[PDB]
Design a protein around this nucleic acid. Structure first.
Ligand SMILES: [Zn+2]
Ligand SMILES: [Zn+2]
Ligand SMILES: [Zn+2]
Length: 84
DNA sequence: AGATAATGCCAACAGT
DNA sequence: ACTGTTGGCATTATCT
């Protein structure tokens, strides 16, 4: 089952390790706000990356597959499918 | 060299 | 089940 539950919100998890991994979220120190939406972040790079997502179209794309990716390394990993 | 910005990895999560 | 997303976070790249 999932006996372990978050104290802050109504969530449940199988084991204490994943429980703590979730429960830390409610208490992290986030000093970096996004000027678009009031969402907070721990590192400024994370905040700027989030700001990227507020743009409608997803920036990165595949030259051959014609897909759309939010982040550079995801496009790089997708490029591995064309090993020939 | 020291401070700050970007990026890659990872786990949690969610659309299909 | 598959595979995209997200934010956190350590590490790397760029700026001063
Ligand atoms: Zn919670
Ligand atoms: Zn925002
Ligand atoms: Zn492709």
């Amino acid at each position: 089952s999932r006996p372990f539950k978050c104290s802050v919100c109504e969530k449940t998890y199988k084991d204490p390790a994943t429980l703590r991994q979730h429960e830390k979220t409610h208490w992290l120190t986030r000093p970096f706000p996004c000027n678009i939406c009031g969402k907070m972040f721990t590192q400024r790079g994370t905040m700027t990356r989030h700001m990227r997502s507020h743009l409608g179209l997803k920036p990165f794309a595949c030259d051959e597959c014609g897909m759309r990716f939010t982040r550079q390394y995801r496009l790089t990993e997708h490029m591995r499918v064309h090993s020939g």
